[PDB]
Every structure is written in structure tokens, then in C-alpha cells.
Design a protein around this ligand. Structure first.
Ligand SMILES: CCCc1c(OCCCOc2ccc(OCC(=O)O)cc2)ccc(C(C)=O)c1O
Ligand SMILES: CCCc1c(OCCCOc2ccc(OCC(=O)O)cc2)ccc(C(C)=O)c1O
Lengths: 254, 254
């Protein structure tokens, strides 16, 4: 269990290009993108796909590049978890399908602060204000991740906690159309039971931390649901803006 | 390209326990041709739902072998050069619609005019006995023999088969494929690989390549017939269970 927990931690450290440790250090605990000018400045070099069109739509496409890229890292992370690799690829896909966004928003907390978040592997900092100035459609689907992040960061988890927490979110028996539910619920339980002992060791004086995170997991489920509805409104009202094919397959039935 | 072949041949040699050139040795095995011999193999030849009847029990043996071959193929495909780069969801699509095609192809390696090997060649079930099975199960089996016999006439070895098999999995025509161009390109290389490989390994033979491409189409018609028959069995043959995985593959075939 303590060994299983370390194993999950190593899979996390090996598969993610950005850990919270780094994130918090960079954010002192990076080019500031706060308007059209600075974002253009960032796109050229200081920092850094479909043809342009407008600021709000261009930032949405960056969210997509980022999320798809994180989905690739979550796939390798899960695959680096022996039990998960045992399931038939179909169940592996079902789990990733319904869990990556929940996992992405939990991890977004690592690179977020009351004022904004980092982008392009820590090189840039996009202000929450700027993101707020965007067109209503896009500005409102972004804001809630912040509200959840700030609150999430107050629990002060480290990469070791997050590794277990993220594995738990992915290995969930609830997901639509899962084939081997028992097997899955069993892997999660083992994960949760290891998180249980890990927190007691890592955060000795934090009371109620564990049941607090289970609630955070339920919270993430509601955050994604609302994210998905907003994603549906964008596919319906934003005729000119596209959506990466991989993201159309996830929101296919969500 | 010479390496590519050689690299797919090894992935085939370590992922598949039973190879044609091995099934050929132990065939130049306990003979199972009736209920008593099957009984003793099930006791002796230590290779499932409670014993129903002989016809159904043999049907369950097919599923068992079929489900385990899917396990192998999954690992094999994952060894194929660019296969693993494809997003999991496409990997699942390719496996879903290709595994039976692959399976019925490899089946030829262990097939005879008079029967086939089972449980790592320790057993051999006669074709006549399978033909003696109750009305529905006997009819879905026989056609694999008819196809296998003609296929063995091409006298291919394990090196050829490895490319032929990878070529069947990497098919850009499968319904619901996300990155079609990507798959089509990986398939082309496999084919050109198969192309040159056949030149060195079977210089004498004429029209072998066009022959094989036609075999791939035949295999496509074989599974369609197979899936229909399976659908009928899942309908009229109530009380006969179907492995959940096999249920996921067939659910969307017509
Ligand atoms: C995970 C995306 C992280 C992110 C931003 O997050 C905002 C909070 C998250 O907001 C969204 C997340 C995803 C999204 O759509 C894609 C999807 O839902 O899969 C839309 C909004 C905002 C800007 C950038 C830039 C400039 O590079 C960025 O990389
Ligand atoms: C590939 C299965 C190979 C096989 C047999 O093949 C008959 C030709 C293939 O026939 C079928 C293949 C699969 C099948 O259903 C399962 C599926 O469609 O996936 C039904 C018939 C017959 C008997 C056995 C035993 C006694 O162990 C066996 O392992």
C-alpha cells in the first residue's frame, strides 16, 4: 500500500511535464499575458492552431491544445498503473473518457492562483482578469475552474497526494458503459485505502482531510457536468469555432 | 523497411505462444472426437459456466480461446511501430473490428482438413466431431475450416503472417475511426513491407501479394457472416451466455 502509493507517485512524476512543486516555485511560493497585445507577443516568442478569428476563440483553442495534451499524459499515467493496464483496452478508454476532465481540473489547481494560471510549460502567466474580459461564452466556462482551484489549493496537497487523488478519479466504477465494474471498484478501493494511510502520514494534523477530498471528487464530477453543458452550448451557438476531434469523441455522449 | 518487417516478426514471436511453425511440428496431442474424449481432455489436457451440453460447452471453449487471442493481439498491436501513438480510442476501434479477422487468419496455422489443435497443441479436436455438434454451433464452425484450408495453400510462414496480421489490424476503413489518414499511412508501410518481404521470402510464387489482399477482403466477409450467426445465437439460443467482451465487439456489427 505504501509501496503501491510510491509506485503511483513515480508514474505521476514520469508522465507529467508539470508538477505542482514546480508550479508553486515558478509562481514564487514567466511572461504576463493580460491583453491582445501581450498574447500576440507571447505567441511570437517570449512564450510560444486552426486559422485565427478572434481573441476569445483563439484562447479557447489554446485550452483545447492544453487539455488534449494533458489527456495524452493522463493516458500514459494510467497505463503506468499495473492494475489499470490489466483491464481490456475498452474499459481503459471508458475510464479515460469520463475521467480526464475531472482529473484535468483537479491538476489545474496546481498551476492556478487567485490572479491567473500558467501556460506553455510554466513560461507564461495568463491573468484571470484578461480571461474574464473574453466574450461571455468563453469567459463563463473558464471562470468556474478558478473558483474550484483556489478552494482546492487551500487543502494544501503535494504531488504525492495528487498522484493518488488523480488515480482514484480515473479508476472509478461509476462511469457509463464500464464493462468490468467489480474489478474497477476494487482497484479504486485499494487506491482510496492507500490515500487514506498516505494522508495520515503526510498530513498528520489535518483533520477531515480525507472525507474532504472524497467530497472534492464529487465536486469535480459536478464541475465537469456543468463544463460539458457549457461545451454543448458552444458547439450549438459558436458555429464558426471548431473542436479537436478527440474532444468531440469525449463529449460525444457526455 | 527491412527492419520494420523484422521488428513486427519478433513482436509476433513473443506475443503469440503458438505459432504456425510450431503448430506444424506437433501436427507433422490427445484426440478429442466425442463426449468421452472431450471429458478426459477436460480432466487430462488441463486447458467456464456449469456444464450445459456438449454443443454449448464447445461453444464456450471457442469464446475462451477467442477472448485470450484478443489479449495477445492487443499486446501485439501495441508492439506495432506507430500503433501505440494512435489515441487509445482509435486503438480500441482497430481492435474491435479487426481482432476476429486476425483470429480467423491465424486459426489457419493450427487447422487441418481433419481438425485443429487446442490447449497449446496438447489436444486436437476433429472437424467431424465439430460437425457433429447440434444444429447451430456446427454451422458457424465449418466455414472457418473451408477458409483455413484454402489459406494454408498459400504456404505462408510466421514471418509473412506477422505483417499480414498487422495489416489487418491497421485498417483505415473501420467504422468510427478518428484519425483515418494516420491509420491508412501506417497500413501502407506495413503493406509495402509485406510487399518487399514476399519478394525475398516467396520469389517463386506468383501473384501472392494480390492474392493476400483478396484474402483480407474474404476475411472481412467471413467475420460479417460470423457476426450475423453470433447475433442469431444471442437471440434464439437464450440461456447460452456470451462473454461480455465479445458482447461489446458484436453489439455494433450488422
Ligand atoms: C486546461 C486549459 C488551461 C488553460 C486555460 O485554462 C482556463 C481554465 C480551464 O478552462 C477551459 C478548459 C477546457 C476548455 O475546453 C476544452 C475541453 O473542455 O476539453 C475550455 C475552457 C486558459 C488559457 C490557456 C492558454 C492561453 O493556453 C490554457 O492553457
Ligand atoms: C478460435 C476458437 C478455436 C476453437 C475451435 O474453433 C472452431 C473454428 C472457429 O469457430 C468459432 C470461433 C469463435 C466463436 O465464438 C466466439 C467469438 O465469435 O468471438 C464461435 C465459433 C473449436 C474448438 C475449440 C476448443 C474445443 O477449444 C477451439 O478452441
Amino acid at each position: 500500500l505504501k509501496a503501491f502509493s510510491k509506485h503511483i507517485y513515480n508514474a505521476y512524476l514520469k508522465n507529467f511535464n508539470m508538477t505542482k512543486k514546480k508550479a508553486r516555485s515558478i509562481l514564487t511560493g514567466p511572461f504576463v499575458i493580460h491583453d491582445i497585445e501581450t498574447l500576440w507577443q507571447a505567441e511570437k516568442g517570449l512564450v510560444w492552431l486552426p486559422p485565427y478569428k478572434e481573441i476569445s476563440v483563439h484562447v479557447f483553442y489554446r485550452c483545447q491544445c492544453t487539455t488534449v495534451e494533458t489527456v495524452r499524459e493522463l493516458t500514459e499515467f494510467a497505463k503506468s498503473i499495473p492494475s489499470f493496464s490489466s483491464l481490456f483496452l475498452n474499459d481503459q478508454v471508458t475510464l479515460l473518457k469520463y475521467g480526464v476532465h475531472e482529473a484535468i481540473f483537479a491538476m489545474l489547481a496546481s498551476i492556478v492562483n487567485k490572479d491567473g494560471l500558467l501556460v506553455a510549460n510554466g513560461s507564461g502567466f495568463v491573468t484571470r482578469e484578461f480571461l474574464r474580459s473574453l466574450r461571455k461564452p468563453f469567459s463563463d466556462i473558464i471562470e468556474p475552474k478558478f473558483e474550484f482551484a483556489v478552494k482546492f489549493n487551500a487543502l494544501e496537497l503535494d504531488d504525492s497526494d495528487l498522484a493518488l487523488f488523480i488515480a482514484a478519479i480515473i479508476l472509478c466504477g461509476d462511469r457509463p458503459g464500464l464493462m468490468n465494474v467489480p474489478r474497477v471498484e476494487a482497484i479504486q478501493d485499494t487506491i482510496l485505502r492507500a490515500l487514506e494511510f498516505h494522508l495520515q502520514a503526510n498530513h498528520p494534523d489535518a483533520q477531515q482531510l480525507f472525507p474532504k477530498l472524497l467530497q472534492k471528487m464529487a465536486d469535480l464530477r459536478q464541475l465537469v457536468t456543468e463544463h460539458a453543458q457549457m461545451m454543448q452550448r458552444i458547439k450549438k451557438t459558436e458555429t464558426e469555432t471548431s473542436l479537436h476531434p478527440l474532444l468531440q469523441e469525449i463529449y460525444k455522449d457526455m
